[PDB]
Amino acid sequence: STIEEQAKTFLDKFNHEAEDLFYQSSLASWNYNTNITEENVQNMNNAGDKWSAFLKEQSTLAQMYPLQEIQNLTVKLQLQALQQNGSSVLSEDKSKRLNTILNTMSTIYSTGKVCNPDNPQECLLLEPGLNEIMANSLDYNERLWAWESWRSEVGKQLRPLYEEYVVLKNEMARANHYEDYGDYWRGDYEVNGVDGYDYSRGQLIEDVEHTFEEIKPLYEHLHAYVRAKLMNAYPSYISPIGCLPAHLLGDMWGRFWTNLYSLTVPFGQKPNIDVTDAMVDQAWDAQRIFKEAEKFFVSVGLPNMTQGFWENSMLTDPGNVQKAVCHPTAWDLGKGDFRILMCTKVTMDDFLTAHHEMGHIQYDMAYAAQPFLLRNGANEGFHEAVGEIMSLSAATPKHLKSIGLLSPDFQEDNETEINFLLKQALTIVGTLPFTYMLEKWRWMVFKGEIPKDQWMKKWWEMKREIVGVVEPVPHDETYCDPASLFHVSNDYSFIRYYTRTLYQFQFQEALCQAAKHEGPLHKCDISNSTEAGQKLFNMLRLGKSEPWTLALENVVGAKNMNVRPLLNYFEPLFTWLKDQNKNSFVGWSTDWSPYAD
Amino acid sequence: TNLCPFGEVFNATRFASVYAWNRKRISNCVADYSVLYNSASFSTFKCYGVSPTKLNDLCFTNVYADSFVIRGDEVRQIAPGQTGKIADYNYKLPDDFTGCVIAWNSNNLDSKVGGNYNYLYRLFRKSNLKPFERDISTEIYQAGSTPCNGVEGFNCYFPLQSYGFQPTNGVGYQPYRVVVLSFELLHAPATVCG
Numbered sequence: 001s002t003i004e005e006q007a008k009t010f011l012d013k014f015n016h017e018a019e020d021l022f023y024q025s026s027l028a029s030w031n032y033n034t035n036i037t038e039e040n041v042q043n044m045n046n047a048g049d050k051w052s053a054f055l056k057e058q059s060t061l062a063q064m065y066p067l068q069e070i071q072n073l074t075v076k077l078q079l080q081a082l083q084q085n086g087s088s089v090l091s092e093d094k095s096k097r098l099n100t101i102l103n104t105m106s107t108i109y110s111t112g113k114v115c116n117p118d119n120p121q122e123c124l125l126l127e128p129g130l131n132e133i134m135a136n137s138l139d140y141n142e143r144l145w146a147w148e149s150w151r152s153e154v155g156k157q158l159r160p161l162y163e164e165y166v167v168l169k170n171e172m173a174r175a176n177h178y179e180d181y182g183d184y185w186r187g188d189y190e191v192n193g194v195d196g197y198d199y200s201r202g203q204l205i206e207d208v209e210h211t212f213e214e215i216k217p218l219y220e221h222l223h224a225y226v227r228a229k230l231m232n233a234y235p236s237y238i239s240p241i242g243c244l245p246a247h248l249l250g251d252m253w254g255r256f257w258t259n260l261y262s263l264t265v266p267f268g269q270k271p272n273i274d275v276t277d278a279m280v281d282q283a284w285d286a287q288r289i290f291k292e293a294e295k296f297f298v299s300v301g302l303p304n305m306t307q308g309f310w311e312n313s314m315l316t317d318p319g320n321v322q323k324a325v326c327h328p329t330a331w332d333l334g335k336g337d338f339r340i341l342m343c344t345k346v347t348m349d350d351f352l353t354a355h356h357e358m359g360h361i362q363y364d365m366a367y368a369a370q371p372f373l374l375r376n377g378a379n380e381g382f383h384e385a386v387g388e389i390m391s392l393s394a395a396t397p398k399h400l401k402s403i404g405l406l407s408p409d410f411q412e413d414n415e416t417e418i419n420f421l422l423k424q425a426l427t428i429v430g431t432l433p434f435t436y437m438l439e440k441w442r443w444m445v446f447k448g449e450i451p452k453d454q455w456m457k458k459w460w461e462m463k464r465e466i467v468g469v470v471e472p473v474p475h476d477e478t479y480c481d482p483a484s485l486f487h488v489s490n491d492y493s494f495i496r497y498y499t500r501t502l503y504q505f506q507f508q509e510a511l512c513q514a515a516k517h518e519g520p521l522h523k524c525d526i527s528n529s530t531e532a533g534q535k536l537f538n539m540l541r542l543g544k545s546e547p548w549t550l551a552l553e554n555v556v557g558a559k560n561m562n563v564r565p566l567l568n569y570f571e572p573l574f575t576w577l578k579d580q581n582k583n584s585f586v587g588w589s590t591d592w593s594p595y596a597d
Numbered sequence: 598t599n600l601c602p603f604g605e606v607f608n609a610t611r612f613a614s615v616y617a618w619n620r621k622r623i624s625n626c627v628a629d630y631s632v633l634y635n636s637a638s639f640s641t642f643k644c645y646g647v648s649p650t651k652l653n654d655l656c657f658t659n660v661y662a663d664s665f666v667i668r669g670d671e672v673r674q675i676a677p678g679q680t681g682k683i684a685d686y687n688y689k690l691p692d693d694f695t696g697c698v699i700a701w702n703s704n705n706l707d708s709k710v711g712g713n714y715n716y717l718y719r720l721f722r723k724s725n726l727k728p729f730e731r732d733i734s735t736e737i738y739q740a741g742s743t744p745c746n747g748v749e750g751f752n753c754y755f756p757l758q759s760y761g762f763q764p765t766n767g768v769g770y771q772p773y774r775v776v777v778l779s780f781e782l783l784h785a786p787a788t789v790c791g
């Protein structure tokens with residue numbers, strides 16, 4: 001009778017149709033990804049097309065019930081998710097133009113190549129060629145050549161496309177009554193109509209900026225320590241008061257500073273924990289690795305894996321006859337079918353990755369009873385936050401001793417912990433100014449605050465000011481250096497890596513408290529704590545049926561993103577950095593550059 | 598003194614869809630209810646009213662054996678006082694139910710790669726079923742006010758949806774064969790004993 005009762009019946013029909021159509025698609029996608037054949041690309045495309053067509057038809061249909069006349073909020077959440085027409089609010093001509101632009105930028109990125117200035121037939125792609133240079137080379141000029149020629153050969157191609165992408169995406173977003181495409185992206189965090197849990201799209205800007213201010217002193221000190229270490233190794237290339245040259249950061253963008261570890265390691269003769277040899281000594285295999293991770297989750301009160309998981313997952317490289325896509329992924333196919341795909345090696349890295357991916361599965365199993373559309377993380381940052389904390393616990397010396405991979409005669413001390421925290425900070429803290437700065441620039445481009453003729457000028461001013469990184473070669477507006485990173489040229493939002501990073505330390509802090517952990521937060525292992533498992537499970541089973549602010553509060557007692565646990569985690573390194581830096585300049589002047597003499 | 602034909606109900610090659618649940622009347626025969634219990638091949642065998650061990654020492658005028666296929670997660674609705682799509686729209690047990698409910702996993706027979714769509718269930722109905730009622734209509738369900746004129750459209754859904762049984766589903770989604778035994782007493786002689 002009423003509009004809500006009809007929407008309920010419509011969703012009732014959608015859920016049952018969607019489950020089966022999504023299941024076929026996932027199944028066809030699975031057979032391609034474990035067995036790369038031309039026939040399988042085809043089945044994968046057809047079943048995905050059916051699923052895409054089903055959604056467009058159901059989206060149109062869902063728009064005939066106005067949310068304005070729906071009071072039940074979970075009905076309202078589902079209808080709204082299905083109603084977001086997205087691109088189909090543009091004219092067909094603009095949609096086709098946009099999808100063509102998207103496609104071209106994507107293939108420019110994945111097929112873009114540079115050839116060395118001596119041999120026009122010997123070329124490198126980004127992956128593996130340029131990435132191997134930017135992660136491994138110590139040679140200043142090789143790194144400079146890779147950095148610059150990536151941005152001038154492929155970035156210049158992306159520039160005109162990116163300009164037209166911004167125009168069309170903004171048209172798309174305004175037609176859906178957002179103020180621009182960045183505001184559209186910030187929609188992931190919006191909560192309306194739940195008293196004491198609402199969250200506006202603009203509020204995300206303020207909380208990212210406020211939490212970032214509190215991160216700056218840790219980052220300034222990390223930056224100053226890293227600059228001093230690099231200056232010792234490159235004395236004629238680095239100013240003691242300047243920004244870090246962008247091509248000296250350990251990958252193609254300085255997205256993570258992970259690969260600076262060999263040049264910056266504090267206590268360079270202390271042994272690093274690597275249980276790989278011990279796994280090989282005890283003849284572990286992939287099966288044992290995943291059995292151990294299962295044991296980890298069972299120890300905190302969470303279910304074991306389903307029988308189908310063990311039967312249907314692909315946990316080792318399937319030999320050489322069939323080729324597989326070996327990037328580790330957790331699959332939620334629907335209908336109680338959960339799988340991990342991973343070409344597992346007998347290494348500590350893959351041992352930790354397995355706990356990470358199985359955390360995804362554990363999240364997927366917990367919200368499987370939610371209606372189809374609410375089967376997801378509470379927001380874009382939750383799934384990855386959940387995966388990360390599992391590797392935190394699994395890697396600690398306590399846990400590695402507990403499972404017999406680390407000798408009890410292993411000696412943890414001051415220095416090995418500072419080593420570990422610095423390696424952690426290079427990756428985790430190093431990416432936070434990078435991530436904030438990149439998204440801020442996109443948010444301002446989408447908002448219209450950066451004219452086209454200052455795109456690159458503003459990009460490099462914000463790199464120098466916010467990130468403390470300076471370009472080694474001047475770039476005019478024929479470049480599009482943002483787009484030389486995957487997420488920009490492939491149309492993915494980036495703030496998720498910032499929010500995820502804060503969430504994970506909030507979770508870990510809460511769970512380690514519930515586990516009664518004594519000592520510095522980075523040493524905590526939540527193993528054997530059913531109190532920790534329950535507190536996590538109370539959020540996991542929510543999916544996205546509740547506001548993310550409430551889902552967060554279930555675990556950590558607060559309703560918002562908070563930096564304090566991240567700083568708490570890094571406090572032992574902070575005080576050590578501050579002491580190390582007593583004879584250094586802390587901070588950076590932005591006018592120095594490698595090419596200005 | 599002939600044996601009750603339970604093998605043809607339990608070992609049928611193909612079961613009914615639950616919306617069109619099959620009923621077999623059992624009469625004038627001798628039934629060994631403790632070979633059924635002591636098979637150790639059923640995941641569910643919950644009698645409501647008297648123990649199997651004890652009802653093998655009993656006589657009834659008529660026994661009914663209803664059989665059908667549902668999802669693993671739905672077997673719990675084959676019990677008195679349950680709600681859900683099966684209990685409300687397909688097969689409804691009364692409150693004072695006195696028979697037995699048997700079920701087992703039939704993933705090996707009732708699912709196949711690419712999907713077995715043979716089995717259907719009723720997704721919508723204007724109201725709930727009375728106990729032991731059966732509805733096999735295929736009338737388009739009018740969810741709105743505009744009539745349907747016998748075709749699917751906005752607010753007009755075909756009322757029967759198919760299960761899609763693939764062998765790789767989870768146990769909650771796998772097919773389960775179900776036999777329900779109803780025992781009745783009347784004024785006529787008791788033609789079923791053990």
Ligand SMILES: *[C@@H]1O[C@H](CO)[C@@H](O)[C@H](O)[C@H]1NC(C)=O
Pocket residue numbers: 035037039040322
């Ligand atoms: C891989 O795919 C081919 C065709 O796409 C199929 O015939 C073959 O059986 C598959 N291999 C395995 C191991 O399933």
Ligand SMILES: *[C@@H]1O[C@H](CO)[C@@H](O)[C@H](O)[C@H]1NC(C)=O
Pocket residue numbers: 008071072073074075
């Ligand atoms: C919303 O709808 C679902 C199903 O229609 C129902 O179970 C739930 O209790 C309802 N909640 C509210 C607050 O209306």
Ligand SMILES: *[C@@H]1O[C@H](CO)[C@@H](O)[C@H](O)[C@H]1NC(C)=O
Pocket residue numbers: 304305306307
């Ligand atoms: C998972 O744990 C339960 C609880 O003991 C057990 O009954 C079940 O058989 C286990 N599953 C597997 C695949 O071992």
Ligand SMILES: *[C@@H]1O[C@H](CO)[C@@H](O)[C@H](O)[C@H]1NC(C)=O
Pocket residue numbers: 299398399402403525527528
């Ligand atoms: C968890 O408990 C078991 C049983 O007491 C023990 O063998 C294992 O080492 C424990 N793990 C930790 C990290 O305490």
Ligand SMILES: *[C@@H]1O[C@H](CO)[C@@H](O)[C@H](O)[C@H]1NC(C)=O
Pocket residue numbers: 603604605607608
């Ligand atoms: C069904 O078949 C099996 C296998 O032969 C048999 O043991 C069983 O008794 C049969 N069921 C009945 C009710 O006779």
Ligand SMILES: [Cl-]
Pocket residue numbers: 253481482
């Ligand atoms: Cl850049």
Ligand SMILES: [Zn+2]
Pocket residue numbers: 356357360383384387
């Ligand atoms: Zn992950």
